[PDB]
Design a protein around this ligand. Structure first.
Ligand SMILES: *[C@@H]1O[C@H](CO[C@@H]2O[C@@H](C)[C@@H](O)[C@@H](O)[C@@H]2O)[C@@H](O[C@@H]2O[C@H](CO)[C@@H](O[C@@H]3O[C@H](CO[C@H]4O[C@H](CO)[C@@H](O)[C@H](O)[C@@H]4O)[C@@H](O)[C@H](O[C@H]4O[C@H](CO)[C@@H](O)[C@H](O)[C@@H]4O)[C@@H]3O)[C@H](O)[C@H]2NC(C)=O)[C@H](O)[C@H]1NC(C)=O
Ligand SMILES: *[C@@H]1O[C@H](CO[C@@H]2O[C@@H](C)[C@@H](O)[C@@H](O)[C@@H]2O)[C@@H](O[C@@H]2O[C@H](CO)[C@@H](O[C@@H]3O[C@H](CO[C@H]4O[C@H](CO)[C@@H](O)[C@H](O)[C@@H]4O)[C@@H](O)[C@H](O[C@H]4O[C@H](CO)[C@@H](O)[C@H](O)[C@@H]4O)[C@@H]3O)[C@H](O)[C@H]2NC(C)=O)[C@H](O)[C@H]1NC(C)=O
Ligand code: HEM
Ligand code: HEM
Ligand SMILES: *[C@@H]1O[C@H](CO)[C@@H](O)[C@H](O)[C@H]1NC(C)=O
Ligand SMILES: *[C@@H]1O[C@H](CO)[C@@H](O)[C@H](O)[C@H]1NC(C)=O
Ligand SMILES: *[C@@H]1O[C@H](CO)[C@@H](O)[C@H](O)[C@H]1NC(C)=O
Ligand SMILES: *[C@@H]1O[C@H](CO)[C@@H](O)[C@H](O)[C@H]1NC(C)=O
Ligand SMILES: [C-]#N
Ligand SMILES: [C-]#N
Ligand SMILES: [Br-]
Ligand SMILES: [Br-]
Ligand SMILES: [Br-]
Ligand SMILES: [Br-]
Ligand SMILES: [Br-]
Ligand SMILES: [Br-]
Ligand SMILES: [Br-]
Ligand SMILES: [Br-]
Ligand SMILES: [Ca+2]
Ligand SMILES: [Ca+2]
Lengths: 466, 104, 466, 104
């Protein structure tokens, strides 16, 4: 079979067919590799096929700790009672921890640089190595965990490994929730969608469904439109890290060897802070580094991420554009003229209709990212509704939400409210100059930056067991 | 599910006491709208040649990408009010929320 | 494990245990037989177990025609081109058709009277012989189908069998919908619940999910509270049909022989018309004929319907009383005092608290039938919410709803609006005296009755193809 | 589903065109609320001895019926405003709407 070596359309493959006159895949009979998502109920002729979430839906930093028990225990340093996460036993990053290596079958990372022989990393989530920048974020939180556990151990000497691990894990989970709802989501949704879908938190409600909705797995892919065609690296003074400060994205996918052998995570973290994201515009949706050259080094041919997003939505049996507009209480354009009105762009609407025929058939990702962005947001009304609806259910339906009564003390909550991504970077890297709050907005050195020294450390006083 | 607990489980199990699998790992996604398959229950639109979706041919995902998504890389517009970190946190966060497995 | 003959609790059996000082089953080693409802995805360690609907959710008279193609064809007369439903080949009811006999293996009907040797009836649904009064309704509708097909044959000679079958089945379908939403439902819900859950029909909405909800299968069992301890049979002057006018229900279940050998369906239909239903009262919920002696003659022990309903809701993983109240936007009683207020009955609330410990755990049927009845309705707020929401979906989400544009002509709808169960009874039986509309309210002869000759027949002139 | 039809299918398939199995026979019920099982996904409350529901002992269904449902027939109240036909249409109608299979 192998969905990666053939274009045969047989289970579990659903290869993308190639249009005549493609600018790249001239062989009309070729295809782009695609495996159908595992069905929740294999081979049933009664159930409506559904897909599976392998992860905990909760915002609980499970990408750090894992969502399955064997893995969770394998991620932990069980050689002592320090409650730490296991770290790479082969390489360090200027004296700081790197993620431990994974042990895969045909490790895709090996293929990115055959001579370097650096395997993929092992983390709470299997995709930590997909791009070095994601790897660097994973390493950052791994360091923060071990830092927290070390501090808590000085704080509370009687505390054993399990206690230290759990207490640090809880703080890391709190950090992800705060950075996400306080700093990130408002810049995704815009103030108006923020107020509509995310009203002031009141308390945990055990009747709120916290599961991830199928459409969310496709709708949150709005982020693919934010990707730049390069991985940017900057030295300690935020200047281009020579001789290669701009690496084409098609050569960093699964490129773990670049973190190990090309300077660690600091140059990468400065690049993320000091470079603008790509702005999504109606005739500038997504770059060819992911549209023509996705996973170029680890596949028989380059994949198309936007196209993969659309094929995935079909694989998942997801309703079209208008059905989702309706779900969200938004007007459903039925003609080109009406679509032109909703998109504030008749040309785009024409383009959409020549492909789909009816606005009812536009795939959710495509329709979602086509919509004009909300004021001070980076998604339109449809994606705002879907994304804002999902995050509310994740906050409201979480018995372990950081602000839920009984999870942390008042004094602990006040301490946690002061956390910031810039300080966390200061705490776990050799970078001494970081972005001004908000980190997701600031993007210009030196204008948007300040010294780490001006940022107060996390006050752990209230975690002292009296 | 445990009487009282101080920490989340690893699997998410027992977060919701009345329905202890909600939000837990290795469970089916929730459906906000009924699924739409070619045969109504399993085959994806685009699977059977000649099978239209609601009156029109299924547009090749790759054709849509080529005609709607493709654009000249030197036209890329930098977001003056967003850092690439905005991009990266989203992906990191996505990896806290969902991973849809496929056979190897 | 044999669930009928054993009290051992292993898949697929979930026997109801016997409490101490049970008024009937003194032996606690005994149990009430229970088979777990078939799982939609057997043996899965991924899916949350769900149950199966074997029927079409739509109000389409699938209980007459069947919900599967093999049955449906076997229920039709395939010896000519008249488009009729096959009738009993061994017995008639005063020159009128009976349902054909079914061929069941361990046929329960045969056990209700060994020497009569009358088997269960074959119909669109497997339960047509469960009680003689139901069989009478199945027989009445089957007759109406063949009457319609006959008239339609005189009206449109060129119409083949298939055309006649389908046009007849389509009128019958509308008949079931009209009687249900016009006469029945308003008396279930009462005026206030009717307006709230069933506003005036507009037209077909394809975004309205018409599936039966799992909770409905248990909530609509509200009907079990209206059951009288006897099957009442009346002669042509509506007097007790000697020698046995009042037969214990524990001796009518699956007693098909009684329809065939004891007068046919006329004595039964007159009994339904001129006998009051039992009213549901908080201290008179459901009679012992179904609570103590359910299906006595056709198995090792008498079942308890109310108890089966509660065991069934747990089998189906259905949420408790307060979860459903909340789903319905109804206040959720947490103390015994609160429950007494909601139930307007402190004595009942105490009994419920003493059984369940918390109103959160009250099984949905129990809590549902426990609520005081809405004015001019026969269910309370919770059951009204659950039942009204289900029926609106069955109406609005049905492409073939009799009132949807395109289904019938404006002239065909005018003719259908003049149908009624009483007139249908007049067209297919020897009964010439029938209940005055509304047939669900009328129950007193002679006060609530009129001659068949005073009721207008259905005019099929607008069904003329010409 | 046929681009055009004339009558209902016997199984209900294709009544809804965008989602062809909705309302059709031999399909799983829709869940208006997430299921509540003893183990979270399959075992019914009252299955495992000593295992409580929401902090309280599961009451035997027969016990609830004995204590709350049982009543002396002589106290039966005839409904002055409904006929027995009101009960019977109900049962007939239920049998147009749902049947939940069990093994023989
Ligand atoms: C055709 O029928 C469609 C279905 O209608 C429902 O069922 C029928 C039988 C009727 O009873 C009808 O009254 C029912 O609504 C119908 O589409 C429906 O339209 C409503 C209103 O637009 C939609 O509600 C909106 O939902 C979004 C999304 O959240 C929902 O889903 C999540 C996840 O399941 C839940 O957690 C939520 O609680 C919601 O259920 C909401 O964001 C939105 O609310 C927000 O906006 C409104 C407006 O300002 C505010 O009042 C709120 O406070 C929020 O700010 C709405 O609640 C519903 O999702 C949608 N269903 C479907 C299947 O599409 C359609 O309009 C009908 N068309 C016609 C012509 O009749
Ligand atoms: C705890 O959260 C619970 C869930 O809340 C939802 O999710 C959170 C994150 C927020 O987005 C919140 O806004 C959402 O509601 C919440 O329980 C929910 O409460 C609502 C409000 O009462 C319930 O809505 C009512 O539903 C019933 C039943 O029909 C619903 O389901 C059917 C079947 O799926 C749909 O087809 C319908 O469209 C409905 O969605 C309706 O009868 C009722 O409307 C009727 O009454 C109102 C008022 O008279 C009229 O305006 C309407 O026209 C109707 O006549 C509401 O639509 C919701 O079912 C319920 N969900 C759950 C899981 O129980 C709870 O209140 C929160 N508690 C606290 C303290 O915050
Ligand atoms: C380095 C940046 C990113 C990638 C490289 C990348 C790649 C993918 C791929 C290959 C998939 C699966 C495609 C398929 O369906 O076959 C994918 C899925 C998802 N993404 Fe991606 N992604 C990168 C970056 C982002 C960002 C910034 C996101 C959000 C802001 C984002 C989201 C998602 C989501 C939610 C999915 C689905 C995950 C699942 O399996 O459930 N991605 N991305
Ligand atoms: C002669 C009157 C009626 C019965 C005899 C009778 C019996 C039952 C039984 C045995 C079940 C199954 C119990 C279990 O869960 O083990 C049952 C289920 C359902 N009923 Fe019954 N019923 C009689 C009458 C009525 C009336 C008047 C009803 C409604 C107004 C009614 C409804 C229901 C429903 C909805 C079910 C579930 C059907 C399914 O399999 O999905 N019943 N009843
Ligand atoms: C465990 O912790 C000790 C002390 O911090 C460290 O030296 C050791 O390398 C760690 N083991 C692993 C596998 O990371
Ligand atoms: C591969 O890694 C090696 C180190 O093992 C490095 O010298 C070389 O530059 C890398 N190759 C490429 C093509 O970048
Ligand atoms: C079919 O119809 C004919 C004429 O009405 C009749 O003789 C025959 O009994 C019917 N067959 C069955 C099996 O009902
Ligand atoms: C069974 O039916 C026969 C007629 O076939 C009748 O004589 C007898 O009374 C019935 N038996 C019972 C127990 O009513
Ligand atoms: C991206 N995942
Ligand atoms: C009752 N069935
Ligand atoms: Br290692
Ligand atoms: Br990936
Ligand atoms: Br620096
Ligand atoms: Br969905
Ligand atoms: Br026969
Ligand atoms: Br039955
Ligand atoms: Br008469
Ligand atoms: Br349900
Ligand atoms: Ca998670
Ligand atoms: Ca039906």
């Amino acid at each position: 079979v192998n969905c990666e070596t053939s274009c045969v359309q047989q289970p579990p493959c659903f290869p993308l067919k190639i249009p005549p006159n493609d600018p790249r895949i001239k062989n009309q009979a070729d295809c782009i590799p695609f495996f159908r998502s595992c069905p929740a109920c294999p081979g049933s002729n009664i159930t409506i096929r559904n897909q599976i979430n392998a992860l905990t839906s909760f915002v609980d930093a499970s990408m750090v700790y894992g969502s399955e028990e064997p893995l969770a225990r394998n991620l932990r340093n069980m050689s002592n009672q320090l409650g730490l996460l296991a770290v790479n036993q082969r390489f360090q990053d200027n004296g700081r921890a790197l993620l431990p290596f994974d042990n895969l079958h045909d490790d895709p990372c090996l293929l990115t640089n055959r001579s370097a022989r650096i395997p993929c990393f092992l983390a709470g989530d299997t995709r930590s190595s997909e791009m070095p920048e994601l790897t660097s974020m994973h390493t950052l939180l791994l360091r923060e965990h071990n830092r927290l556990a070390t501090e808590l151990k000085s704080l509370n000497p009687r505390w054993d490994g399990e206690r230290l691990y759990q207490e640090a894990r809880k703080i890391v989970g709190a950090m992800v929730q705060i950075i996400t709802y306080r700093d990130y989501l408002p810049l995704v949704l815009g103030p108006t969608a923020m107020r509509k879908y995310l009203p002031t938190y009141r308390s945990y409600n055990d009747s709120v469904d916290p599961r991830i909705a199928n459409v969310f797995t496709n709708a949150f892919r709005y982020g693919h439109t934010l990707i730049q065609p390069f991985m940017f690296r900057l030295d300690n003074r935020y200047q281009p890290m020579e001789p290669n400060p701009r690496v084409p994205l098609s050569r960093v996918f699964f490129a773990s060897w670049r973190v190990v052998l090309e300077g660690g995570i600091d140059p990468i973290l400065r690049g993320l802070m000091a470079t603008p994201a790509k702005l999504n515009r109606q005739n500038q949706i997504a770059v060819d580094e992911i549209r023509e050259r996705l996973f170029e080094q680890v596949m028989r041919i380059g994949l198309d991420l936007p196209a993969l997003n659309m094929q995935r939505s079909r694989d998942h049996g997801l309703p079209g554009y208008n059905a989702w507009r309706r779900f969200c209480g938004l007007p459903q354009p039925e003609t080109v003229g009406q679509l032109g009105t909703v998109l504030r762009n008749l040309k785009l609407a024409r383009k959409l209709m020549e492909q789909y025929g009816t606005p009812n058939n536009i795939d959710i990702w495509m329709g979602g990212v086509s919509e004009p962005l909300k004021r001070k947001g980076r998604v339109g009304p449809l994606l705002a509704c879907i994304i804002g609806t999902q995050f509310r259910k994740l906050r409201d339906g979480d018995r372990f939400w950081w602000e839920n009564e009984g999870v942390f003390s008042m004094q602990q909550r006040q301490a946690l409210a002061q956390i910031s991504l810039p300080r966390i970077i200061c705490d776990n890297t050799g970078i001494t100059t970081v972005s001004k709050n908000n980190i997701f907005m600031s993007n210009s050195y030196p204008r948007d930056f300040v010294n780490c020294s001006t940022l107060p450390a996390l006050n752990l006083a209230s975690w002292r067991e009296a | 599910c445990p009487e009282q607990d101080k920490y989340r489980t690893i699997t998410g199990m027992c977060n919701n006491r009345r329905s202890p699998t909600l939000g837990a790992s290795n469970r089916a996604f929730v459906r906000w709208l009924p699924a739409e398959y070619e045969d109504g229950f399993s085959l994806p639109y685009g699977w059977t040649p000649g099978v239209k979706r609601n009156g029109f041919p299924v547009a090749l995902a790759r054709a849509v990408s080529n005609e709607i998504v493709r654009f000249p890389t030197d036209q890329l517009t930098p977001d003056q009010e967003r850092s690439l970190m905005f991009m990266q946190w989203g992906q990191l966060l996505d990896h806290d929320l969902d991973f849809t497995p496929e056979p190897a």
